[PDB]
Amino acid sequence: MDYQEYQQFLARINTARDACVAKDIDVDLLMARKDYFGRELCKSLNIEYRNDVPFIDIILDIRPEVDPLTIDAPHITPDNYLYINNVLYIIDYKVSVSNESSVITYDKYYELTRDISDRLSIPIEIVIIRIDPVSRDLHINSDRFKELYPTIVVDINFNQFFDLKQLLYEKFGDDEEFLLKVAHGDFTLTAPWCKTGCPEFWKHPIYKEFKMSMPVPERRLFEESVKFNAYESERWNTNLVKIREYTKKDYSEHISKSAKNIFLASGFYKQPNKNEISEGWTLMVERVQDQREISKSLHDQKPSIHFIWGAHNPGNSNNATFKLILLSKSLQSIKGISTYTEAFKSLGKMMDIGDKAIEYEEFCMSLKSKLEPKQINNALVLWEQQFMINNDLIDKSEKLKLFKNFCGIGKHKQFKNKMLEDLEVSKPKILDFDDANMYLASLTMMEQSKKILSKSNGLKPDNFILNEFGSRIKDANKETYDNMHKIFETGYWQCISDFSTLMKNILSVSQYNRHNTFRIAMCANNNVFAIVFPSADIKTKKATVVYSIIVLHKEEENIFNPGCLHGTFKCMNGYISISRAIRLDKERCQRIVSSPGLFLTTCLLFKHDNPTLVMSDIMNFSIYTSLSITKSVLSLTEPARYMIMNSLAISSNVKDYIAEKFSPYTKTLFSVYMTRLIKNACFDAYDQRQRVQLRDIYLSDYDITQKGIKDNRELTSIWFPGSVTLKEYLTQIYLPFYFNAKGLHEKHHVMVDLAKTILEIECEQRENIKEIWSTNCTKQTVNLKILIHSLCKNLLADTSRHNHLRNRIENRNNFRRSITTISTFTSSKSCLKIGDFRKEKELRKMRLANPMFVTDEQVCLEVGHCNYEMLRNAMPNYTDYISTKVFDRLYELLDKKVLTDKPVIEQIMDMMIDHKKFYFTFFNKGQKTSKDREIFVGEYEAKMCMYAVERIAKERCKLNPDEMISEPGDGKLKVLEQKSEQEIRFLVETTRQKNREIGKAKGLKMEINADMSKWSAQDVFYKYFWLIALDPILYPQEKERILYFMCNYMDKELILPDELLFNLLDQKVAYQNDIIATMTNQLNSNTVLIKRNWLQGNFNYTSSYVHSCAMSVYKEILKEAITLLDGSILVNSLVHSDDNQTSITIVQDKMENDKIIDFAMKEFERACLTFGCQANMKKTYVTNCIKEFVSLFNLYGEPFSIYGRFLLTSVGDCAYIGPYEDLASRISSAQTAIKHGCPPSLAWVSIAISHWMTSLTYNMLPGQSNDPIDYFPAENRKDIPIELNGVLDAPLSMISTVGLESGNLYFLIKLLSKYTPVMQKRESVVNQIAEVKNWKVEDLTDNEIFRLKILRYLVLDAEMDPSDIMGETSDMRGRSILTPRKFTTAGSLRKLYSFSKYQDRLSSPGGMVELFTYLLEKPELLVTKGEDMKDYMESVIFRYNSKRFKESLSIQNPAQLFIEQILFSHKPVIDFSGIRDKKEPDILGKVTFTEAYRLLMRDLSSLELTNDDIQVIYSYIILNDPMMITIANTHILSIYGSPQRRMGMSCSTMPEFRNLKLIHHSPALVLRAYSKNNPDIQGADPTEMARDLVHLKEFVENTNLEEKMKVRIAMNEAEKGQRDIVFELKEMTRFYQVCYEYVKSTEHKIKVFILPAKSYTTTDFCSLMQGNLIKDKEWYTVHYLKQILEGEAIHSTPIFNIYY
RNA sequence: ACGAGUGUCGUACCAAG
RNA sequence: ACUUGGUAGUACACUACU
Ligand SMILES: Nc1ncnc2c1ncn2[C@@H]1O[C@H](COP(=O)(O)OP(=O)(O)OP(=O)(O)O)[C@@H](O)[C@H]1O
Ligand SMILES: [Mg+2]
Ligand SMILES: [Mg+2]
């Protein structure tokens, strides 16, 4: 306010450098504003200015008689008080715009002062005076106060504070860190969350164990720290300062002792030289031979690929009947004697229709038009290519031999009949990869496959990919087009396509089979056939398909045999090759079907821009990797990454990893081949450590124009013969891990493995860990005094304003609001319930197979597989549990009065003491790792308590609040680059400053990429106790309650899942050393107590904070050690959950770099160990120039990412929800790959493959059943929107910027160019849109009118519903016009309490009518889902009406949906009902895709399109958003310039993207404010939401949405004659869904791009983005007609030259 | 045979003769 | 063991971080 204060604030702003200081300045500015307003208001009220007066002082002033000890004043600290006429007024000053903080403060003060008002028999009136800073208006809630002061005027001015805040925000606007550090600074009040503490915490056995471990002074320090109150104390930091001073001596001694070790370093670290790799390999081989059964016989090999293939015959015909006759005659003529020759000959005999081909065809057609076999000549025909076994034509012994031994059908004994001798005990059998003969055989197989499959298929390439995207691919890169065409020419492509098609045909006929029948499956190849043997229905649970491949070939040895052949036999006119029978499940068949796209993607990714590589060599490896559906290759791909990276690194423990953990699993020959490849790569990795080089650095004191790694091909290729660049080397290292064959774990074994892992960790902790604290870096211990001192220092540094920190934590996480407003407490995720659930789970008696659990009554009983009923009788101490949904659990708890309308933090504090005994269960994640990770599911109450703890710990972390731990943002890729920049500059200036005097000072760049081993499983949870006691933003009662919760959490019990217990109860033989039985008291109970494991991912943020403290200690040690050498050091540490990236830049001359590297690595390990952490030797390594943070690379300043992992995943993962959904996910993945550096041609190839695979899945290819070309006014698929099963037509720049909306934008831009007058062809898009008024609607074409009608009535409006919208919320509508139905699992819904309530209300006289009218009179319950108890419970019951909502709660197994798209292509699956509503299978709909097309076209033709409609389209698709306008202008006004080579890359976000955002808030917040008609809501800034609501109201008014809704409602009411609740509710739902979709379309999540140059303006970003995506080999300088809106070498270990 | 596995599994199930 | 008849929609599946 005064001159000195304002200039001091200016000085602080100008001298501010970090975001934390800016946040402190903002807090100080807010406090100064509040103080100014309070002083001026006190002047107006003629009362003495008091601020933050303790309530006890108030009472003593008004009641001096009462002793202060007698009265227990509330722990509030009111701003002011006024006691007159026996009335006490409590006055609080507020300078906020919203009234939410005032309401919260009033409620809290009222409920905390009512007690003391009652005891003293004096009324206490709570009055909050709030001034609005922009309108200067006073708001007073109290009517008595307003009577007592009739007129209050405060003529003041807040302009100075506004300008100061504006300057501060301008200086820090482009900092994302600053924006979210001051996001929720609306101060409500400071009050404890609970009135009382937890006295029984001090008597907890866990607390007593924790206390007895520490020394007596530490016990006293902890006791006084828990009891310290930072709000009544004279200073908030007295406790922290005292404890820091106490621990300072030992902390300094530890730091000095660690730093002095630099002189004791020997310089010898763990270098990955070839001798070390050889020793590790020998130890690994010994370990594997110990743990596996090693076979040197080639007959023991498993199929590398489960297919045998041969080339087709051009002479023969591809007719099915002729192929069948040829196959029968070839099978009948098998020559020689063999085990199954008679069976095969008889099988051919019983399918030889002979001369009666016409009768066979007519019988098959008659069957198709409309089962008893029909006797064709020596054939019993049941269907097309289905034949019954003829017992007259085959001998019984041969039939049994063929069905039992060859196919494994009925050979085994049933589980009930199995004896002890029937059980097999043996180690898994794998091939000897070291054996020279085995490797030679694998090499022979690879060479033979390359010989056969390299030949041309003889057919001209013609397919969907070429016909749809060949021009774009050729324009982006002609070399990519040539490579793809050569791939299409080869026999690799024909073989893999034949395998995929034959697999689809085998699956399509796997429904109706009988034991005495077999089927023939064919493909486009006339020489390849499949015999399908009887099995269970494929749609059933865990069903398998069993088949054998037969190939006819004229010349022997022309058969493709990847270890699958059974035999080759001479037959009439050639040879017939038969493979062994193969059983596969649904997921492996899905992998086979989707293999061709993966093969193409892998081939094009590996061959991209590498003339040294040979395409045939790449294809030979890619066909084996793409068609690998077994664990053998998964056991090799992931270890290869870490092994090769660690052998490449300067220092790593790769030898120990190979010796102890690397376990190759080689059951196939390709596994032996790949193992040899990995061994050679690891051997040669350290040899080429020398051949990596650095670019010359062009820096000009303001930016570094050129940097990175030289793109010279001197490294040896890993999987192929050839040479690669370092980037290509890393790509070859990392891509094979992303050949994701997920879902290959079997629960039978993986559940036991996970249980064994958890229980073994728990046992090792139970018996081998006796001490908690240590000073010698003992494993799983913490240095107590170092931990305490570090926590004190970091808490002091991060708690500048403790009141505002507490307020921000409360505001961000909705502590003072209802539980129903938290997303994680109302979600559809799973949680656990403990209780009696016999009825839910129990849905001729059997005896258990295990002999230990059989009573004398059950001795004479049939053995059966264990179920829940059988498990109940076996276990005495069985704790019953069930899994439910989170929202259902919340509904049940609210219904049973466990949870109330109280603020959520009060309920959490209550539950921390009420809920004492915790339960968890586990399941397998199902990831592509060779060993799966376990995932723990807990209860609702555990979720509440952990929510409170994690939200407290999250604020102090440096992590971005709005991102998840599971998916780190790409912004890290930028941050790393920034760090590298400084570490380069620091290296340049320090070396030049020290060498100016000239024994020469030398530099060193060190980069530690580390992961922690068993981050949650092996941790000291006790170290977090001190984190809560020392926290200065917590009251003592809150600390006691949280510590009580943590003590109870250390006593948690893991529940073993029922499936695992079923597995263990069916064994019949005891396990020799059964850890599971030992932990469960010989299966007495299903619960095991877990003490030191905090569970997978429950404490991410707390652990991250402690990890950051450990890195701070490491930095301190390094700085002191370098100070001992009188050198310069720069340490930068990036910390994620357990991932670390530490960069060290050192300039010194005392000693050699090797000693410094050894010392730094030893100190890193010791610093991790001192805090209870251990570095993972599998993922920890040290380099000079390669930074590896979470999946992101920095190659000496150049950002880098393996973008192929985004492409491959798009092929690999499919949810099979629907055509448009799958296409949208794949296109989003392609856009993500583009942002990460994908060349344009590869992106176009990815998009083409995505479209082709989507069309294959849903029969949308040209000429197929769901082909939409004939139903719509379109000549090509390009003319149909992708939402209507069309293909995407948009420039790659548009896809990169606006992914899914690119099609509509590009169509609108094309329409503008076609109908814009010639004088305005090249102008701003605003000027061209203005002339749309001059367009003639009759001049438009049918396609243009049809697409414009879609845009007007289906995008900007809701004229036709994709599904039944009753029960849907405002966000459930998407962009999908046609949506297939999915599963609605009846078992999943029967487990929901709220679902039973919904059924009860549905079967009631008029309950649903009352619910609908309640929803209608409160329409914001459609946008929200309830903000209190009653509204949430009504909204849940209403939401149960939605069929789409019940499908979201159901199980959508991707394999079952994949076979659904194969078996039931013609089934109606679409719920399409025209314009605004004008035993059955599990999945069923109203109409099919073609019927949907016809109804959609018929209803579109009835609509009317006018000029005003086109104006509305152009105004609210393009003109509304600054981004869309910018993109349109860039496309229209683009001029490409001179070509330029791509040399260096930079990470850049679109500059000033905040000015390109129309709506600041999220769609949910905007819709909440609009539906409630209030600008200020819980998580919104009132001023910004005012203009957001202005924009939304403009959209609603100009498009006549509400007026048309009212007219429709009135017309319907007139037609019916009475008010219709359902119609009006549906109309409101449609209106809110349209508003939500508009607001969502407004926002674009532009993020970090990798671009050839740095961008400083929005135009620069657009030009770089556009010029980058034209050609692969080079990029163009792009200009716009109008506005769119001296060399020196450095003396360092990584040698480099700077051109300054 | 095939899938899985240094954990006994899948390799359809039931009834009648 | 073999013959005939009947039955069978999913891994009833999944979390902590938005
Ligand atoms: N899928 C997940 N679900 C829950 N928490 C997870 C998940 N993935 C990672 N986390 C959390 O992040 C941490 C890091 O786990 P990560 O996969 O890096 O390995 P780790 O468990 O530390 O073990 P290791 O390095 O020995 O394999 C976990 O300990 C857990 O807290
Ligand atoms: Mg880890
Ligand atoms: Mg990690």
Q: Please, are residues A1164 and A1008 in contact by the beta-carbon 8 Å criterion?
A: yes
The answer to whether A1067 CB sits below 7 Å from nucleic acid chain B is yes
Interhelix angle A1563-1572/A1621-1642, rounded to 10 degrees, is 140
Q: Which helix (H) or strand (E) holds A566?
A: strand A565-571
For residue A400, give Cα distances in angstroms to A340, A379, A395, A406, A488. Answer: 11, 20, 9, 9, 43
What are the structure tokens assigned to A60, written together? 């003593």
3-state secondary structure of A256: helix
CB neighbour class for A1149 (10 Å; exposed up to 12, middle 13-18, buried from 19): middle
Write the single-letter amino acid at A1552.
E
Residue A159, exposed/middle/buried by CB under 10 A (0-12, 13-18, 19+)? exposed
Q: Which amino acid is at A1279?
A: D
Assign A809 to helix, strand or coil: helix
Long-range contacts, A1274-1278 (Cβ 8 Å, 24+): A1274/A1343, A1274/A1346, A1275/A1343, A1277/A468, A1278/A468
| Distance from C-alpha of A1686 to C-alpha of A698, rounded to nearest angstrom | 10
Residue of A1012, A1139, A1177 with the most ligand 1 atoms within 8 Å of its CB, for mutation: A1012
Q: Report in angstroms the alpha-carbon separations of A1069 from A23, A418, A420, A428, A850.
A: 66, 12, 8, 19, 7
- DSSP symbol at A1518: I
A175: helix, strand or coil = coil
Q: Please give the Cα distance from A81 to A47 (Å, whole number).
A: 9
User: How far, in Å, CA of A1111 to CA of A1135, rounded?
Assistant: 8
Distance of CA A583 to the CA centre of its chain: 33
Closest CA to A1121 of A1094, A1097, A1148, A1141: A1148
Amino acid in position A65: E
Give me ligand 1 centre to Cα A1096, in Å. 6
Q: How far apart are the first and last CA of chain A?
A: 48
Minimum-distance ligand 1 atom for the alpha carbon of A1013: 26
d(CA A510, CA A543): 10
* Ligand having the closest approach to the CA of A1103: 1
Contact at 8 Å (CB) between A538 and A624?
no
Which pair of tokens denotes residue A1359? 């004229």
Distance CA A848, CA A1572 (A): 60
Q: Does A1101 contact ligand 1 (Cβ within 6 A)? A: no
3-state helix, strand, coil in chain A (%, to 5): 50, 10, 40
Please tell me whether any atom of strand B lies within 7 Å of the Cβ of A333.
Answer: no
- The nt closest to A751 (CA vs C1′) is B7
- Whether residue A905 contacts residue A193, with contact meaning beta carbons closer than 8 Å, is answered with yes
A1511 touches strand C (CB under 7 A): no
The answer to whether the CB of A926 is under 6 A from ligand 1 is no
Distance CA A630, CA A931 (A): 14
Rounded Cα distance between A166 and A1513, Å, is: 37
Are A206 and A1015 contacting, i.e. CB atoms less than 8 angstroms apart? no
User: Which residue bears the tokens 């002890």?
Assistant: A420
Cβ A261 vs Cβ A1125: under 8 Å? no
Q: What is the 3-state secondary structure (H, E, C) of A1297-1356?
A: HCCCCHHHHHHHHHHHHHHCCHHHCCCCHHHHHHHHHHCCHHHCCHHHHHHHHHHHHHHC
The integer distance in angstroms from the CA atom of A581 to the C1' atom of B4 is 17
Residue located via tokens 């049939």: A862
CA distance A1348 to A1337: 11
Tokens of A1469: 């699956």
Distance CA A929, CA A162 (A): 55
**A611 CA, C2 C1': separation in Å?**
65
State the Cα–Cα distance between residues A503 and A543, nearest whole angstrom: 15
Given the DSSP bridges, would you call strands A723-724 and A715-716 parallel, antiparallel or unpaired?
antiparallel
The torsion of the CA quartet A109, A115, A117, A119, rounded to 10 degrees, works out to -160
Integer Cα distance of A127 and A114 in angstroms: 14
Give the separation between CA A272 and CA A647, rounded to whole angstroms. Answer: 5
CA atoms of A1167 and A1118, how far apart (whole Å):
11
A923 CA, C13 C1': separation in Å?
A: 9
Contact A1175, A1114 (CB under 8 A): no
Residues ≥6 apart with Cβ < 8 Å to A759: A1075, A1076, A1079, A1088
Residues A225 and A1030 sit within 8 Å (Cβ to Cβ): yes
Say if residue A12 is exposed, middle or buried (CB neighbours under 10 Å; 0-12, 13-18, 19+).
middle
Residues 6 or more apart whose Cβ sits within 8 Å of residue A997: none
The string over A275-292, giving b where at least 16 C-beta atoms fall within 10 Å of a residue's C-beta and e elsewhere, is: ebbeebbebbbebbeeeb
Q: Helices H, strands E: what count in chain A?
A: 62, 41
Burial class (CB in 10 A: 0-12, 13-18, 19+), A941: buried
Minimal CA–CA distance to A349: which of A326, A328, A367, A370?
Answer: A328
Look up the domain containing A132 and give its range: 3-182
SS3 (DSSP) at A1282: helix
- Chain A window 938-957: residues with CB closer than 7 Å to nucleic chain C are 943, 946-947, 950, 954
Q: Which residues 1464-1503 on A are within 7 A of strand C at the CB atom?
A: 1464, 1467, 1479, 1481-1484
The long-range contacts involving A610-613, CB below 8 angstroms and separated by at least 24 positions, are A610/A713, A610/A722, A610/A724, A610/A728, A612/A713, A612/A717, A612/A722, A612/A723, A612/A724, A613/A717, A613/A720, A613/A721, A613/A722
CA angle A996, A1002, A1003 (to 5 degrees): 110
CATH number, domain of A168, equals 3.40.91.60
Cβ(A1176) – ligand 1 distance below 6 Å: yes
What residue type is A1683 in one-letter code? Q
Q: Enter the tokens of residue A1624.
A: 């009006």
User: In sequence order, which residues have a C-beta less than 8 Å from that of residue A432 and are 6 or more positions away?
Assistant: A294, A295, A296, A438, A666
**Residues near A126 by beta carbon (within 8 Å), at least 6 away in sequence:** A89, A90, A92, A106, A109, A110, A113, A141, A142
Which ranges in A298-435 belong to alpha helices (H)? 320-332, 341-349, 357-369, 396-400
Longest dimension (CA), chain A: 121
A932: its two tokens: 């799966």
Strand partners, A576: A552, A569
Task: Identify the CA nearest to A1391 among candidates A927, A833, A921, A872.
Answer: A833
CA A721 vs CA A255, A433, A598, A615, A646: distances in Å: 51, 21, 22, 11, 22
Residue with tokens 């040479």: A723
Rounded to an integer, what distance in angstroms lies between the CA atom of residue A1374 and that of residue A277? 54
C-beta of residue A368 within 8 angstroms of C-beta of residue A385: no
Query: Which pair of structure tokens corresponds to residue A734?
Result: 């990392």
Hey, what amino acid is at A393? Answer: L
- What phi-psi label fits residue A563: left (phi over 0), alpha (psi between -120 and 50 degrees) or beta? left
Secondary element (H or E) of residue A92 = strand A87-94
The one-character DSSP state at A1686 is -
- Point out which residues pair with A548 in neighbouring strands: A531
Half-sphere exposure of A1000 (CA within 13 A, CB side): 10
Please give the DSSP secondary-structure letter assigned to residue A694. Answer: -
Question: CB-hemisphere CA count at 13 Å for A1251?
Answer: 26
Which residue's CA is minimally distant from atom 24 of ligand 1?
Answer: A1013
Residues of A 627-646 whose CB lies less than 7 Å from any atom of strand B: 629-632
Q: CA separation (Å) from A1550 to A976, A1657, A1660?
A: 18, 8, 9
Between helix A478-489 and helix A586-607 the angle, nearest 10°, is: 130
Q: Is A1385 in the pocket of ligand 1 (CB under 6 A)?
A: no
DSSP code, position A309:
B
**Considering only residues 717-756 of protein chain A, which place a Cβ less than 7 A from any atom of strand C?**
743, 747
Return the closest-CA partner of residue A91 out of A142, A22, A32: A142
Task: Report how far residue A1295's alpha carbon sits from residue A1240's, in angstroms, rounded to the nearest whole number.
Answer: 11
Say if ligand 1 is within 6 A of residue A1096 CB: yes
Closest CA to A1134 of A979, A963, A950, A986: A979
| Distance in Å, CA A361 to ligand 3 centroid | 62
Residue type, A304: S
The pair of structure tokens assigned to A1566 is 């905007």
Q: What is the DSSP string of A486-544?
A: HHHHBHHHHHHHHHHHHHHHHHHT-SS--TTEEEEEE-S-SSEEEEEEP-S-TTSTT--
Please check whether strand C approaches the CB of A842 to within 7 Å.
no
Pick from A661, A923, A1013, A1016 the residue to mutate for probing ligand 1's pocket: most ligand atoms within 8 Å of its CB: A1016
Q: What is the spatial order of strands in the sheet that A138-140 belongs to?
A: A80-84, A87-94, A124-131, A138-140
Instruction: Pull the structure tokens for residue A862.
Output: 């049939």
Backbone angles phi, psi at A148, to 5 degrees: -70, -35
The answer to whether strand C lies under 7 Å from the CB of residue A1098 is: yes
- Answer whether any strand C atom is within 7 A of the Cβ of A1645: no
Distance CA A1307, CA A1287 (A): 13
Q: What's the reported resolution, in angstroms, to a tenth?
A: 2.8
